Coordinates of C-alpha atoms and ligand atoms in Angstrom, one line a residue:
Chain A
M1 CA -14.4 -20.4 -14.4
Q2 CA -14.5 -18.0 -11.6
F3 CA -14.0 -18.4 -8.1
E4 CA -14.7 -16.4 -4.9
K5 CA -10.9 -17.0 -4.0
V6 CA -7.7 -18.7 -5.1
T7 CA -5.4 -19.9 -2.3
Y8 CA -1.9 -19.6 -3.6
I9 CA 0.8 -21.5 -1.6
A10 CA 4.3 -20.7 -2.4
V11 CA 6.5 -23.4 -1.7
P12 CA 10.4 -22.4 -1.9
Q13 CA 11.8 -25.9 -1.5
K14 CA 15.1 -27.0 -3.1
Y15 CA 16.0 -29.7 -0.6
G16 CA 14.3 -32.6 -2.3
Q17 CA 17.2 -32.5 -4.8
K18 CA 20.8 -31.0 -5.3
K19 CA 20.4 -28.1 -7.8
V20 CA 19.9 -24.6 -6.2
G21 CA 17.3 -22.2 -7.8
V22 CA 14.0 -24.3 -7.9
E23 CA 13.3 -22.7 -4.5
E24 CA 12.8 -19.3 -6.6
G25 CA 10.2 -20.7 -8.8
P26 CA 7.5 -18.9 -7.1
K27 CA 9.3 -15.6 -7.0
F28 CA 9.9 -16.3 -10.7
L29 CA 6.5 -16.9 -12.0
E30 CA 5.5 -13.8 -10.0
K31 CA 7.9 -11.8 -12.3
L32 CA 6.4 -13.1 -15.3
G33 CA 2.8 -12.2 -14.3
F34 CA 1.5 -15.2 -12.4
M35 CA -0.6 -12.8 -10.0
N36 CA -2.1 -11.2 -13.1
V37 CA -3.2 -14.6 -14.3
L38 CA -5.0 -15.5 -11.0
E39 CA -6.5 -12.1 -11.2
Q40 CA -8.6 -13.3 -14.1
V41 CA -10.0 -16.1 -12.1
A42 CA -10.8 -14.7 -8.5
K43 CA -10.7 -11.1 -7.2
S44 CA -9.3 -12.7 -4.0
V45 CA -6.2 -14.2 -3.6
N46 CA -4.9 -15.7 -0.2
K47 CA -1.2 -16.0 -0.6
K48 CA 0.8 -18.3 1.8
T49 CA 4.5 -18.6 1.9
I50 CA 5.8 -21.8 3.3
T51 CA 9.0 -21.1 5.3
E52 CA 12.2 -21.7 3.4
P53 CA 14.7 -23.6 5.2
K54 CA 18.2 -22.0 5.2
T55 CA 20.5 -24.8 6.2
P56 CA 23.6 -26.0 3.8
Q57 CA 22.6 -28.7 1.4
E58 CA 24.3 -31.9 2.4
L59 CA 25.9 -33.2 -0.9
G60 CA 27.4 -36.5 -0.4
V61 CA 26.3 -40.1 -0.2
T62 CA 23.1 -40.4 1.4
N63 CA 20.1 -42.5 0.9
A64 CA 17.7 -39.6 1.8
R65 CA 19.2 -36.1 1.4
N66 CA 18.0 -33.2 3.7
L67 CA 15.3 -35.3 5.3
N68 CA 14.9 -32.6 8.3
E69 CA 14.2 -29.8 5.5
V70 CA 11.8 -31.9 3.4
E71 CA 10.1 -33.0 6.6
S72 CA 9.6 -29.5 8.1
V73 CA 8.3 -28.1 4.9
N74 CA 5.9 -30.8 4.0
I75 CA 4.5 -30.7 7.6
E76 CA 3.9 -26.9 7.3
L77 CA 2.5 -27.5 3.8
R78 CA 0.0 -30.2 4.9
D79 CA -1.3 -28.1 7.9
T80 CA -1.7 -25.0 5.7
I81 CA -3.6 -26.9 3.1
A82 CA -5.9 -28.6 5.7
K83 CA -6.9 -25.3 6.8
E84 CA -7.2 -23.5 3.4
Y85 CA -8.4 -26.4 1.1
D86 CA -11.9 -25.8 -0.2
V87 CA -14.1 -27.8 -2.5
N88 CA -15.8 -24.4 -3.9
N89 CA -12.6 -22.7 -4.5
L90 CA -9.0 -23.5 -6.0
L91 CA -5.9 -23.9 -4.1
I92 CA -2.5 -23.8 -6.2
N93 CA 0.7 -24.9 -4.8
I94 CA 3.8 -23.7 -6.7
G95 CA 7.1 -25.4 -5.8
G96 CA 9.8 -26.0 -5.3
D97 CA 10.8 -29.5 -6.3
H98 CA 8.6 -32.6 -6.4
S99 CA 9.3 -33.6 -2.5
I100 CA 6.5 -31.1 -1.8
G101 CA 3.9 -33.3 -3.2
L102 CA 3.8 -35.5 -0.2
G103 CA 3.0 -32.4 1.7
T104 CA 0.4 -31.3 -0.9
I105 CA -1.4 -34.9 -1.1
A106 CA -1.1 -34.9 2.9
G107 CA -2.9 -31.6 3.1
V108 CA -5.8 -32.7 0.9
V109 CA -6.3 -35.7 2.9
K110 CA -6.0 -33.9 6.2
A111 CA -8.7 -31.5 5.0
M112 CA -11.2 -34.2 4.1
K113 CA -13.0 -36.7 6.4
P114 CA -11.2 -40.1 6.8
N115 CA -13.6 -41.8 4.4
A116 CA -13.2 -39.5 1.6
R117 CA -11.8 -40.9 -1.7
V118 CA -8.9 -38.5 -2.8
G119 CA -7.7 -39.1 -6.5
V120 CA -4.3 -37.9 -7.8
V121 CA -3.4 -37.2 -11.3
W122 CA 0.6 -37.1 -11.4
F123 CA 1.8 -35.6 -14.6
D124 CA 5.7 -36.1 -14.6
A125 CA 8.5 -37.7 -16.5
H126 CA 9.0 -39.6 -13.3
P127 CA 6.9 -41.7 -10.9
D128 CA 8.6 -40.5 -7.8
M129 CA 8.0 -44.0 -6.3
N130 CA 11.6 -44.6 -5.0
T131 CA 12.4 -45.3 -1.6
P132 CA 15.6 -44.4 0.2
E133 CA 16.8 -48.0 -0.3
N134 CA 16.4 -48.2 -3.9
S135 CA 17.0 -44.6 -5.0
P136 CA 20.0 -43.8 -7.3
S137 CA 20.2 -40.3 -6.0
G138 CA 18.9 -40.2 -2.3
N139 CA 16.8 -37.1 -3.7
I140 CA 13.7 -37.0 -1.7
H141 CA 11.9 -35.5 -4.8
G142 CA 11.9 -39.0 -6.3
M143 CA 10.2 -40.6 -3.3
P144 CA 7.2 -38.5 -2.3
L145 CA 4.4 -40.6 -4.0
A146 CA 5.9 -43.8 -2.4
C147 CA 5.7 -41.8 0.9
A148 CA 1.9 -41.2 0.2
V149 CA 1.3 -44.9 -0.3
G150 CA 3.2 -45.7 2.9
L151 CA 6.6 -47.0 1.2
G152 CA 9.4 -45.0 2.7
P153 CA 11.0 -44.1 5.8
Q154 CA 8.8 -43.2 8.9
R155 CA 9.4 -39.5 9.3
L156 CA 7.9 -38.9 5.8
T157 CA 5.4 -41.4 5.6
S158 CA 3.9 -40.4 9.0
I159 CA 3.2 -36.9 7.6
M160 CA 0.3 -38.6 5.8
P161 CA -2.8 -38.6 8.3
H162 CA -3.5 -42.0 6.5
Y163 CA -2.0 -43.4 3.2
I164 CA -3.5 -43.0 -0.2
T165 CA -3.2 -46.3 -2.2
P166 CA -1.8 -47.2 -5.7
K167 CA -5.3 -47.5 -7.0
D168 CA -5.8 -43.7 -6.4
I169 CA -2.8 -42.7 -8.7
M170 CA -3.1 -41.8 -12.5
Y171 CA 0.4 -41.2 -14.1
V172 CA 0.7 -38.9 -17.2
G173 CA 3.7 -38.7 -19.4
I174 CA 6.0 -41.0 -17.3
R175 CA 9.2 -42.2 -19.2
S176 CA 12.1 -42.1 -16.7
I177 CA 11.2 -45.0 -14.6
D178 CA 13.7 -46.7 -12.0
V179 CA 13.7 -50.5 -11.4
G180 CA 11.8 -50.2 -8.0
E181 CA 9.4 -47.7 -9.5
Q182 CA 8.6 -50.3 -12.3
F183 CA 8.0 -52.9 -9.7
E184 CA 5.3 -50.9 -8.0
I185 CA 3.7 -50.1 -11.4
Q186 CA 3.4 -53.7 -12.5
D187 CA 2.9 -55.1 -9.0
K188 CA 0.1 -52.6 -7.8
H189 CA -1.3 -52.2 -11.4
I190 CA -1.1 -48.4 -11.3
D191 CA -3.0 -46.7 -13.9
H192 CA -0.8 -44.7 -16.4
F193 CA -0.2 -43.2 -19.8
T194 CA 3.6 -42.9 -20.6
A195 CA 4.7 -40.1 -22.9
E196 CA 4.7 -42.6 -25.7
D197 CA 1.3 -44.1 -24.9
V198 CA -0.1 -40.5 -24.8
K199 CA 1.2 -39.8 -28.4
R200 CA -0.3 -43.0 -29.6
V201 CA -3.7 -42.8 -28.1
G202 CA -4.1 -39.0 -28.0
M203 CA -4.6 -36.8 -24.9
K204 CA -8.2 -36.8 -25.4
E205 CA -8.5 -40.4 -24.3
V206 CA -6.1 -39.7 -21.3
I207 CA -8.9 -37.3 -20.1
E208 CA -11.6 -39.9 -20.6
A209 CA -9.5 -42.4 -18.7
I210 CA -9.1 -39.9 -15.8
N211 CA -12.7 -38.9 -15.8
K212 CA -13.9 -42.6 -15.8
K213 CA -11.5 -43.6 -13.2
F214 CA -12.3 -40.9 -10.7
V215 CA -16.2 -40.9 -11.1
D216 CA -16.6 -42.4 -7.5
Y217 CA -14.1 -40.3 -5.8
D218 CA -14.7 -37.1 -3.7
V219 CA -11.9 -35.0 -4.9
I220 CA -8.9 -35.0 -7.6
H221 CA -5.7 -33.5 -7.0
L222 CA -3.2 -32.7 -9.8
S223 CA 0.4 -32.8 -9.2
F224 CA 2.0 -31.2 -12.4
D225 CA 5.6 -31.7 -12.8
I226 CA 6.7 -29.3 -15.8
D227 CA 9.4 -31.9 -16.7
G228 CA 6.5 -34.0 -17.8
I229 CA 6.3 -31.8 -20.8
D230 CA 9.1 -32.2 -23.6
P231 CA 12.5 -30.4 -23.0
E232 CA 12.2 -28.6 -26.3
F233 CA 9.6 -26.2 -24.4
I234 CA 10.8 -26.8 -20.7
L235 CA 14.2 -26.3 -20.0
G236 CA 14.4 -24.6 -16.7
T237 CA 14.0 -28.1 -14.7
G238 CA 16.6 -30.2 -12.9
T239 CA 15.9 -33.4 -14.5
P240 CA 14.7 -32.9 -18.2
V241 CA 13.8 -36.1 -19.9
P242 CA 13.2 -36.4 -23.8
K243 CA 10.4 -37.7 -25.8
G244 CA 8.0 -35.9 -23.3
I245 CA 4.5 -34.5 -23.8
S246 CA 4.3 -31.9 -26.3
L247 CA 3.3 -28.2 -25.2
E248 CA 0.1 -28.6 -27.4
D249 CA -1.0 -31.8 -25.5
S250 CA 0.0 -30.1 -22.2
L251 CA -2.4 -27.2 -22.8
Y252 CA -5.0 -29.4 -23.7
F253 CA -4.4 -31.6 -20.7
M254 CA -4.6 -28.5 -18.3
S255 CA -7.9 -27.2 -20.2
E256 CA -9.6 -30.4 -19.6
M257 CA -8.4 -31.0 -16.0
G258 CA -9.6 -27.5 -15.1
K259 CA -13.0 -28.5 -16.2
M260 CA -13.3 -31.3 -13.8
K261 CA -15.7 -30.5 -11.0
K262 CA -13.7 -32.8 -8.6
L263 CA -10.5 -30.7 -9.1
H264 CA -9.9 -28.2 -6.3
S265 CA -6.1 -28.3 -6.0
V266 CA -2.9 -28.2 -8.2
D267 CA 0.8 -28.3 -7.6
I268 CA 2.9 -26.9 -10.4
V269 CA 6.5 -28.1 -9.6
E270 CA 10.1 -28.3 -10.6
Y271 CA 10.6 -24.8 -12.3
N272 CA 14.2 -23.9 -11.7
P273 CA 14.5 -20.4 -13.4
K274 CA 18.4 -20.4 -12.5
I275 CA 18.7 -23.2 -15.1
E276 CA 16.4 -21.3 -17.6
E277 CA 13.9 -18.5 -17.1
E278 CA 12.2 -16.9 -19.9
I279 CA 11.1 -19.7 -22.4
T280 CA 10.3 -22.2 -19.7
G281 CA 8.8 -19.6 -17.4
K282 CA 6.4 -18.4 -20.0
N283 CA 5.3 -22.0 -21.1
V284 CA 4.6 -22.7 -17.4
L285 CA 2.3 -19.8 -17.4
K286 CA 0.6 -20.9 -20.5
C287 CA -0.1 -24.3 -18.9
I288 CA -1.5 -22.4 -15.8
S289 CA -3.6 -20.2 -17.8
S290 CA -5.0 -23.2 -19.8
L291 CA -6.0 -24.6 -16.5
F292 CA -8.1 -21.7 -15.8
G293 CA -9.3 -21.5 -19.4
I294 CA -7.6 -18.0 -20.3
Chain B
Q1 CA 12.5 -6.8 8.1
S2 CA 12.5 -4.8 10.2
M3 CA 8.8 -5.2 11.2
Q4 CA 6.9 -8.6 10.8
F5 CA 2.9 -8.9 10.5
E6 CA 0.6 -11.9 10.5
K7 CA -0.7 -10.5 7.4
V8 CA -0.7 -8.0 4.7
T9 CA -3.7 -7.0 2.8
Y10 CA -2.9 -6.0 -0.7
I11 CA -5.5 -4.3 -2.7
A12 CA -4.8 -3.8 -6.4
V13 CA -6.6 -0.7 -7.6
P14 CA -6.5 -0.5 -11.6
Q15 CA -7.9 3.1 -11.7
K16 CA -7.0 5.4 -14.7
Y17 CA -10.2 7.3 -14.9
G18 CA -9.1 10.1 -12.4
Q19 CA -7.1 11.5 -15.2
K20 CA -6.2 11.2 -19.0
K21 CA -3.3 9.1 -19.7
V22 CA -3.5 5.3 -20.2
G23 CA -1.2 3.0 -18.4
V24 CA -1.6 4.1 -14.7
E25 CA -4.2 1.4 -14.3
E26 CA -1.4 -1.2 -14.9
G27 CA 0.7 0.0 -12.0
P28 CA -0.2 -3.0 -9.7
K29 CA 0.5 -5.5 -12.6
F30 CA 3.9 -3.9 -13.2
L31 CA 5.0 -3.6 -9.5
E32 CA 4.1 -7.3 -9.5
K33 CA 6.6 -8.1 -12.4
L34 CA 9.4 -6.2 -10.5
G35 CA 8.9 -8.3 -7.5
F36 CA 6.3 -6.7 -5.3
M37 CA 5.1 -9.9 -4.0
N38 CA 8.7 -10.9 -3.0
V39 CA 8.9 -7.8 -0.9
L40 CA 5.7 -8.5 1.0
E41 CA 7.0 -12.1 1.4
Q42 CA 9.7 -10.5 3.7
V43 CA 7.1 -8.9 5.9
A44 CA 4.2 -11.4 6.1
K45 CA 3.9 -15.1 5.4
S46 CA 0.2 -14.3 4.4
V47 CA -0.8 -11.9 1.7
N48 CA -4.4 -11.4 1.0
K49 CA -4.7 -9.8 -2.4
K50 CA -8.0 -8.2 -3.4
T51 CA -8.6 -6.6 -6.9
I52 CA -10.8 -3.8 -7.2
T53 CA -13.0 -4.1 -10.4
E54 CA -11.3 -2.4 -13.4
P55 CA -14.0 -0.2 -15.2
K56 CA -13.8 -0.8 -19.2
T57 CA -16.0 1.9 -20.5
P58 CA -14.4 4.7 -22.9
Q59 CA -12.5 7.6 -21.4
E60 CA -14.7 10.7 -21.9
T61 CA -16.1 19.1 -18.5
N62 CA -15.5 19.9 -14.8
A63 CA -15.4 16.2 -13.5
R64 CA -14.2 13.6 -16.0
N65 CA -15.5 9.9 -15.7
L66 CA -17.4 10.5 -12.4
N67 CA -19.1 7.1 -12.8
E68 CA -15.8 5.1 -12.9
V69 CA -14.2 7.2 -10.0
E70 CA -17.4 6.8 -8.0
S71 CA -17.8 2.8 -8.8
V72 CA -14.2 2.3 -7.8
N73 CA -14.0 4.5 -4.6
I74 CA -17.2 2.8 -3.4
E75 CA -15.9 -0.8 -3.8
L76 CA -12.4 0.4 -2.6
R77 CA -13.9 1.9 0.6
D78 CA -16.2 -1.2 1.4
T79 CA -13.1 -3.7 0.8
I80 CA -10.9 -1.8 3.0
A81 CA -13.6 -1.3 5.9
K82 CA -13.6 -5.0 5.8
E83 CA -10.0 -5.7 5.6
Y84 CA -8.5 -2.8 7.7
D85 CA -6.7 -4.1 10.9
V86 CA -4.7 -2.0 13.4
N87 CA -2.6 -5.1 14.0
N88 CA -1.5 -5.7 10.4
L89 CA -0.8 -3.6 7.3
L90 CA -3.0 -2.6 4.2
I91 CA -1.4 -1.7 1.2
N92 CA -3.2 0.0 -1.7
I93 CA -1.5 0.2 -5.0
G94 CA -3.0 2.5 -7.7
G95 CA -4.1 3.5 -10.1
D96 CA -4.1 7.4 -10.0
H97 CA -4.8 9.5 -6.9
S98 CA -8.5 9.6 -7.4
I99 CA -8.4 6.5 -5.4
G100 CA -7.2 8.3 -2.3
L101 CA -10.9 9.4 -1.6
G102 CA -11.8 5.7 -1.7
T103 CA -8.8 4.8 0.7
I104 CA -9.4 7.4 3.4
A105 CA -13.1 6.8 3.0
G106 CA -12.5 2.9 3.9
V107 CA -10.2 3.8 6.8
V108 CA -12.8 6.1 8.3
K109 CA -15.2 3.4 7.7
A110 CA -13.5 0.7 9.3
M111 CA -13.0 2.7 12.6
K112 CA -15.8 3.9 15.1
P113 CA -17.3 7.3 14.1
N114 CA -15.5 9.2 17.2
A115 CA -12.3 7.9 15.5
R116 CA -9.5 10.6 14.7
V117 CA -8.0 9.5 11.3
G118 CA -4.8 11.5 10.4
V119 CA -3.6 11.7 6.7
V120 CA -0.2 12.1 5.5
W121 CA -0.4 13.0 1.9
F122 CA 3.0 12.9 0.3
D123 CA 2.7 14.6 -3.2
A124 CA 3.5 17.3 -5.6
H125 CA 0.0 18.4 -5.7
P126 CA -2.4 19.2 -2.8
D127 CA -5.3 17.5 -4.7
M128 CA -7.8 19.9 -3.3
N129 CA -9.4 21.1 -6.5
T130 CA -13.2 21.2 -6.8
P131 CA -14.8 20.6 -10.4
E132 CA -15.6 24.4 -10.4
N133 CA -12.0 25.5 -9.8
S134 CA -10.1 22.6 -11.6
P135 CA -7.9 23.3 -14.6
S136 CA -8.2 19.9 -15.8
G137 CA -11.4 18.3 -14.8
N138 CA -9.2 15.4 -13.7
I139 CA -10.9 13.9 -10.6
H140 CA -7.2 12.9 -9.2
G141 CA -6.9 16.5 -8.5
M142 CA -10.0 16.4 -6.0
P143 CA -9.7 13.5 -3.7
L144 CA -8.7 15.4 -0.5
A145 CA -11.2 17.9 -1.2
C146 CA -13.9 15.4 -1.3
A147 CA -12.9 13.8 1.8
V148 CA -13.3 17.2 3.8
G149 CA -16.5 17.7 2.0
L150 CA -15.7 20.0 -1.0
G151 CA -16.8 18.6 -4.2
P152 CA -19.9 17.0 -5.8
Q153 CA -22.3 15.0 -3.8
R154 CA -21.6 11.7 -5.6
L155 CA -17.9 11.8 -4.4
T156 CA -18.2 13.4 -1.1
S157 CA -21.0 11.1 0.1
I158 CA -18.6 8.2 -0.2
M159 CA -17.1 9.6 3.1
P160 CA -19.1 8.0 6.1
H161 CA -18.2 11.3 7.6
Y162 CA -15.7 13.9 6.4
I163 CA -12.3 14.4 7.6
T164 CA -11.1 18.3 8.3
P165 CA -8.3 20.1 6.8
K166 CA -6.7 20.1 10.4
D167 CA -6.2 16.1 9.8
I168 CA -4.0 16.6 6.6
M169 CA -0.2 16.6 6.7
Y170 CA 1.2 17.7 3.3
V171 CA 4.7 16.6 2.4
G172 CA 6.6 17.7 -0.9
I173 CA 3.7 19.9 -2.3
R174 CA 4.9 22.3 -4.9
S175 CA 2.5 22.4 -7.8
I176 CA -0.4 24.2 -6.2
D177 CA -3.5 25.7 -8.0
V178 CA -5.1 29.0 -7.0
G179 CA -8.1 27.2 -5.3
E180 CA -5.9 24.7 -3.6
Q181 CA -3.8 27.6 -2.2
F182 CA -6.8 29.3 -0.8
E183 CA -7.7 26.2 1.2
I184 CA -3.9 25.8 2.5
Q185 CA -3.9 29.3 3.8
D186 CA -7.5 29.6 4.9
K187 CA -7.9 26.3 6.8
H188 CA -4.1 26.5 8.2
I189 CA -3.3 23.2 6.6
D190 CA 0.1 21.9 7.9
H191 CA 2.5 21.3 5.2
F192 CA 6.1 21.0 4.1
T193 CA 6.8 22.0 0.5
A194 CA 9.5 20.2 -1.5
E195 CA 11.6 23.3 -0.8
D196 CA 10.6 23.3 3.2
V197 CA 11.7 19.8 3.3
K198 CA 15.0 20.6 1.8
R199 CA 15.7 23.6 4.1
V200 CA 14.6 22.0 7.4
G201 CA 15.5 18.4 6.8
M202 CA 13.0 15.4 6.5
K203 CA 13.9 14.4 10.2
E204 CA 12.0 17.4 11.3
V205 CA 9.0 16.5 8.8
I206 CA 8.7 13.2 10.7
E207 CA 8.8 15.1 14.2
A208 CA 6.1 17.4 13.1
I209 CA 4.0 14.4 11.8
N210 CA 4.6 12.6 15.1
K211 CA 3.8 15.6 17.2
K212 CA 0.7 16.4 15.1
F213 CA -1.0 12.9 15.2
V214 CA -0.4 12.3 19.1
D215 CA -4.2 12.8 19.8
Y216 CA -5.2 10.8 16.9
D217 CA -6.3 7.1 16.7
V218 CA -4.9 6.1 13.1
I219 CA -2.5 7.6 10.5
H220 CA -3.2 6.8 6.8
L221 CA -0.3 7.6 4.3
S222 CA -1.3 8.5 0.7
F223 CA 2.1 8.4 -1.2
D224 CA 1.9 9.7 -4.7
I225 CA 5.4 8.9 -6.3
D226 CA 5.5 12.1 -8.2
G227 CA 6.2 13.7 -4.7
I228 CA 9.6 12.4 -5.6
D229 CA 11.8 14.2 -7.8
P230 CA 11.6 13.2 -11.7
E231 CA 15.3 12.5 -11.7
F232 CA 14.3 9.1 -10.0
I233 CA 10.6 9.0 -10.8
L234 CA 9.6 9.3 -14.4
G235 CA 6.8 6.7 -14.9
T236 CA 4.3 9.3 -13.7
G237 CA 1.6 11.5 -15.6
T238 CA 2.2 14.7 -13.9
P239 CA 6.0 15.0 -13.0
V240 CA 7.1 18.2 -11.3
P241 CA 10.7 19.4 -10.7
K242 CA 12.5 20.2 -7.6
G243 CA 10.8 17.3 -5.6
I244 CA 11.8 15.2 -2.6
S245 CA 15.2 13.3 -3.4
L246 CA 15.0 9.6 -3.2
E247 CA 17.3 9.5 -0.4
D248 CA 14.7 11.7 1.6
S249 CA 11.8 9.6 0.3
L250 CA 13.5 6.4 1.8
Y251 CA 14.3 8.0 5.1
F252 CA 10.8 9.3 5.1
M253 CA 9.1 5.8 4.5
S254 CA 11.6 4.3 7.0
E255 CA 10.3 6.6 9.7
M256 CA 6.6 6.5 8.5
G257 CA 6.8 2.7 8.8
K258 CA 7.9 2.9 12.6
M259 CA 4.6 5.0 13.4
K260 CA 2.5 2.8 15.7
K261 CA -0.6 4.5 14.3
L262 CA 0.4 3.7 10.5
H263 CA -1.7 0.7 9.4
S264 CA -2.7 1.7 5.9
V265 CA -0.8 3.0 2.8
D266 CA -1.5 4.0 -0.8
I267 CA 1.1 3.8 -3.4
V268 CA 0.0 5.8 -6.5
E269 CA 0.4 7.4 -9.7
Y270 CA 2.9 4.7 -11.2
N271 CA 2.4 4.8 -15.0
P272 CA 4.6 1.9 -16.4
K273 CA 3.8 2.8 -20.0
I274 CA 5.4 6.3 -19.4
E275 CA 8.5 4.8 -17.9
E276 CA 8.9 1.2 -16.5
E277 CA 12.3 0.0 -15.1
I278 CA 13.9 2.8 -13.4
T279 CA 10.5 4.2 -11.9
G280 CA 9.4 0.8 -11.1
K281 CA 12.6 -0.1 -9.0
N282 CA 12.6 3.2 -7.2
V283 CA 9.0 2.7 -6.0
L284 CA 9.8 -0.8 -4.8
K285 CA 12.8 0.8 -2.9
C286 CA 10.4 3.3 -1.1
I287 CA 7.8 0.3 -0.4
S288 CA 10.9 -1.7 0.9
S289 CA 12.0 1.1 3.2
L290 CA 8.4 1.5 4.6
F291 CA 8.9 -2.2 5.8
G292 CA 12.4 -1.5 6.9
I293 CA 14.1 -3.5 4.5
Ligands
LIG1 N1 11.8 -36.7 -9.8 C1 13.2 -37.2 -10.3 C2 13.3 -38.7 -9.8 C3 14.8 -39.0 -10.5 C4 15.2 -40.5 -9.9 N2 14.1 -41.6 -10.1 C5 15.8 -40.3 -8.3 O1 15.0 -40.8 -7.5 O2 16.6 -39.5 -8.2
LIG2 N1 -2.9 15.1 -9.5 C1 -2.4 16.1 -10.5 C2 -3.2 17.3 -10.3 C3 -2.9 18.2 -11.7 C4 -3.9 19.7 -11.2 N2 -3.9 20.2 -9.9 C5 -5.3 19.4 -11.6 O1 -6.2 19.4 -10.7 O2 -5.6 19.0 -12.7
LIG3 MN1 8.5 -35.3 -10.0
LIG4 MN1 9.7 -35.2 -13.1
LIG5 MN1 -1.9 13.0 -6.0
LIG6 MN1 0.7 14.2 -7.7

């Protein structure tokens, strides 16, 4: 409903993938009235901008591309979130590519006591459980949730104060799954509704599954990749994938996520307005509004 | 930049009730669409935005919508008193110029009572009318009169203590009512009209500001966009010709921004429902110049 404040962290990060422009997602959501949405929810908005790295993209064969830039940003992001996270208020991270999700889950973990049970809802076309060794792309944005559970290189996994586990993850709308990511989902029994599962069961039952799963957890964190949503509605994204979640289901999802007492932090990620601006931009904002119940 | 700060306090003030025309309450919202936040992002990594509550009563004598201008200026004063900071920058975005009472009130309330607060008031209008001598009854023509203690009790009492006429530097004034002219001659209020600015050059306005506030603790800048010529600024309720050129307004903001005493700025009277893109962009160029971009 209403909050004393909303912490808004702009995270201009493109270095988790190859395509330019996703660093300008915060800027472009601001042009389309993001601040005015937050103005319906809190009279106070503490915006933090995470420093944009300005080194050239390395674009050749590499198993983890621009590690320095993804490291530096996730460290700064974790630290900012640790200071600003608040179970009485809402923190919203706007990306930036999904390599920030390491930084964001790291931050939430760092804010809590070590005995705190942190749940993660990961709404996405991709599980992002690749490692540098099994990654087809070397794009670190495919690796973050692997890094959070301790699978990955030392410089990323060490950003976690301690690791979360596979049993703390609820995947929603996953479809594009690599071989190494499929291994983790079957081997670790990671709860998930694929896009196809969502269609069959109905997004109502995804919510009951989220609510029943995190009953004994302290906090929930939502990492919302816009490309979990069908490309009919979301074009401004670097890796679109068909048969996604409908916009209708994404708004119902955000509506019911927003009503969870445990939910105090949200990432909105992978908006590249240089790919597509107005249609995508507006639909992202409808999802964000639904989260706040506007 | 230009200048870096630890933070910038951004107070959105959606106030239309100081005048008649709808849409000036949406100035903050519309500056945000045109990239205001991204401008502040060049200056501080932190932005604490505060939204002053928009009154939602119908628009209604000698002082129009007193309740709404009172309630907003009280909330604005109080917010500023908590957030004002001589090491950082506070920027108020209006809203009509009836908020300038609230903003000067806030700066005064933030300082110790013995503090000398200077005011640079860049505007086509002196805004020194009282309810009795006002042609319009629009409270946005009255705030600076209220600040010096001329006006009704419910507005003048918002000041912890009053500023005086000798604390005001007017820049670009041209449209002057009879009662406002009385105050300028009678109280010897320092001023450069738009015509004076042209003749002397905006460099000498700055030297006059710098030499005048040498003994003061802080300066506050209240910047009405209609002080700027209507060639460049159309989205404003009361435009007035022969104003300050955009070139001079950017040089003005550049040199204002470099004043050690300047820690607070109002940007006021943007009505994007009158005109949006041209005006909106030029307002932002002025704001960027203030930060030295
Ligand atoms: N978030 C996109 C992931 C795409 C692919 N699994 C990769 O690792 O490149
Ligand atoms: N801010 C515009 C002022 C207009 C006129 N002096 C009045 O008091 O109505
Ligand atoms: Mn992702
Ligand atoms: Mn994805
Ligand atoms: Mn004015
Ligand atoms: Mn004016």
